[PDB]
């Protein structure tokens, strides 16, 4: 149960609280566990039904959803942005030489989707513009209407042109606004309806469930100011400040900001591997999944690379990262391999060629050690 | 008989003193035979059990036992090998120009496997850095610790920035020493207790058994100063000095040292159709032995080279060479034929697509002529 | 107005204890402005300075052996294109050896041109990094000095160059080989041919490769620190092992790229003879028109400049008799555009600077210094001459 050893070293080196692991083939559960304690400072054990915050696992989730929208003719992958909300007209873009210039493309669905929007993120280091999404907040302003988070956005310089560069962005938190645009209803409602309703996901949202707060998993790591170097790997609490309320009834987001629970995402990502309900109810079509999943990003020589963090042998699809060379993956995966993460750790995995899915869940920001990727390799292993 | 005729040719010739082979298919011998004696001197048949040095064919062994404990969460391939041995970081990087610098990337565990951590070797011709390697006496002190020898060479420059190019190193030492430090253990051991012994590959090892001595092929040739043009092909016994001990309990390296025999390397060559024993254990999973034999590092218009001799049409896995394009190849194969060799012309190949493994074992180092391609060539024409 | 910045450079590195004994000369118009000397023949005694004390050039051998086959141009004995191999046959079919191990055929014949510009693919014993310096090394090429340069020609000839002749630019032994094909063309020996035509013209009585008679106690001593050092020795005033690199009284010794014993005032007679191309009376050892062909910038340089084992030549250009400063915007130490010269390895040093009519010598010993006392005499010289 190589699993469990990677788990059980990662909870007795003091690095991780808590994890739980699901994996599933042809939707049913092969291997599963726990590891650890719901927080270090009582050691209650993990929960049944534990809650996470998965931060960017949402952005598959609403992603799955553009597509959904796509499919019943919202909009499409080509759509102007502009046309949804005309603050995004006339973009500028910043350069690293302090040049400002009219944006020669116009910001797409696709564009966000793939984030070749030109948008950035408020921890990015040595980002030209990422300094003045601190400034305004973005991230850290939870308690902010998405709505009104976004026309603070649209003033800023994106830092390339649209469709021409690759940069892990904020685009989800556009998409999820311009989702909200284009139907004239609220994202949280729209992915209530459409997907977590079908999939029986009752534990995932943006707020609490009201039995929740005794299942939340305590967060810890000591990741605005882009650290040069990661903090230490220790066990301390995070501070979230007011980034990511548990009580909000209006906080919604595109990129972050759901809680789940380990069984919910695995209904999810079960779902991935055909577009269906466990009863056969289709929320995508089959073409439009194939769509969604083709890789559509490639990547030079650096590779696909997150604040010069590498995912080797990854291409980027509509929904996040799918493995398109094994020979140049620094972990044990089989082309067609897709998924994402989350920046406390969470990590999740969809297998076709196994009709396998995996999902880990713990909370530490900011790790050292890559928990996910050891987990993936310890089931693929286990095959 | 094309294998008989090939081997008979190159003893009635005076080339090589003894020859041994074997093919197998689906795990039983189909081809197999002998040529020759074990010594010109007294023209001793080859013996039953016949020892060979098997050079380079260390590395594929070394190379599995990585992989093993990468399953086995010892270490992964992007671990920064000065996490586990300190003396490899601040590495410099030295170029053809006497210019020295900081190199601009760590050396990981993949770095090590693939040849492309910018280590080089004492025989390199034209290296800008060899000859101090030579100075060092790097392979000429077989009776230097392992240990002891990585202080030293940890102390000389690289000949490129790790990542960035590939040279045929002296890195699978280096990958033995870390493993030691990573697990607490010794690379003889390990791979006693790993590979050796659940393959029943008794007479494998840094040592001579202790009824070996009679076994032993004697080795031929005039091949530290790197030559400019090759000494000629004659059987003249080779002076080994002390760099190939016999009986140093202590003896352990990475990319050379092993003696073996023919049965023993067939065993190791068979379980790479599988990663398992012939009883059924694993040894390493389907999806590690992937990850392992995928097509890693691809070569440029001069293609793959070692001392400038070509392996046409061969990229670079984790274990060794594997065939990409068979339309470039200078010998039969099939796509994904994959193997390695050593310095006094032992030479081996598993055949996936055929269920094929062969190996030609003989004692001649600066060998003019490719006695295991031209053996392979024979053996891929008989089916 | 200006204070004597050269007698403070050199002292200074006396009294630090990074120089034994060093010298100096700066003359203008042919004719001494500045002057001294700092220090002693040898720390271990303490002896002063001889009258006409002897150093070893090294390097500085380089401009007189260029200078001469230029002269053995100007008389028609061959010209710059002239192939060497019609010289000496050793030098046809060679080869070129890479970093990669590869070895090809020259796909180019080295000419005269190539050698005086370091352009033929020729290394040096002590090149670090180089892809064939171990087999120099090997060969003891600089190391053993007592063999004929006839021999050393031979064994050098069966090597491989480091890259196809004309196509690239490294420092080398490419002097050595001049010195050599010299002979082959004039039939007499490059010792007697720079006394006749160099060194008595000039009357430089105290110059050539062996000490002269009452050399011995007017030879000053060197200090300083095989396999090419990864970094810099300490600069440490130890006395110097020569081996048998170089030799005081072999009478068949001699060489193109090192090897002369000279003083200052020897020096910097060949200098100032370097502004005109006459000797001091009017005799003329080189046209005017053949000395412009000589000093004119020829080899240039890109990114990273021109560099010998990485250490930078800022501005520099190369002629066919060493470097020539072309970018003073580019340069490193105080200079004008159109200086001239080379220096040698125990950190003697010269220049030529025809804008002011001058020429600087600085005289010490000490291999593999980590100071560059010969620019910072240049330095104070050139802040002293408005």
């Known amino acids: ?49 534990a809650i996470y915050r998965i931060y960017s696992m949402t952005k598959p989730i609403v992603s799955f959803l553009a597509m959904m929208l796509i499919e019943r003719g919202v909009f499409r992958l080509s759509s102007p942005i502009q046309n949804f909300d005309p603050r995004f007209k006339s973009m500028k873009v ?37 300094a003045h999404y601190r400034d305004a907040q973005l991230i850290e ?50 992915l209530q309806r459409l997907i977590f309703d079908p999939l029986d996901m009752q534990d995932t949202g ?85 769509l969604a999943l083709a890789p559509r990003v490639h990547f030079g020589a650096r590779g696909m690379r997150i604040n010069d963090e590498p995912f080797a042998g990854y291409s980027w699809n509509l929904l996040g990262r799918v493995m398109t060379d094994v020979g140049a993956a620094a972990y044990a995966t089989h082309l067609g391999e897709f998924g994402w993460s989350g920046a406390a750790a969470t990590y999740f995995w969809v297998d076709p060629t196994k009709n396998m899915t995996g999902c880990v869940m713990t909370q530490f920001l900011g790790s050292q050690h890559p928990i996910g990727s050891d987990m993936q390799a310890a089931a693929m292993s286990m095959l």
């Not at 291997?31 to 929960?47: N, W």
């Not at 021409?164 to 645009?181: F, G, M, N, P, R």
């Not at 595109?254 to 990502?269: E, I, N, P, R, V």
């Open 141 to 190: 302003d939870g308690g902010r209407d998405l709505t009104d988070m976004m026309g603070v956005l649209a003033e800023l310089p994106l830092v390339f042109h649209p469709g021409t560069q690759w940069k892990y962005s904020i685009s989800t938190d556009v998409l999820a606004h311009i989702i909200e645009c284009a139907t004239g209803e609220r994202v949280d409602d729209l």
């Open 94 to 130: 910043i350069d690293q030489h302090a040049h400002i210039e009219p944006a020669t493309a116009l910001i797409t669905i696709e564009h966000l989707l793939t984030h070749q929007a030109g948008f950035s993120y408020d921890f990015s280091l040595g980002c030209p513009i990422s």
């Open 206 to 290: 943006f707020s609490l469930p009201l039995d929740g707060a005794s299942r939340l998993m305590e967060v810890y790591g000591m990741r605005g100011l882009p650290a040069l170097k990661p903090a230490p790997h220790v066990l301390v609490p995070a501070d979230l400040g007011s980034s990511h309320p548990t009580d909000d009834p209006d906080f919604r987001r595109g990129g972050h900001g759901l809680y789940s629970t380990l069984d919910d995402y695995m209904a999810f990502a079960n779902m991935l591997l055909s577009g269906q309900t466990p009863e056969g109810e289709t929320l995508l079509s089959p073409a439009v999944l194939k």
């Open 1 to 49: 149960d190589l699993l469990t050893n990677v788990a059980e070293n990662y909870v007795n080196q003091d690095l991780f609280a808590g994890i739980e692991w699901r994996i599933d083939q042809d939707g049913k559960p092969i291997f599963q566990g726990c590891a650890g304690v719901k927080d270090i400072e009582t050691r209650t054990f993990i929960p049944k039904n």
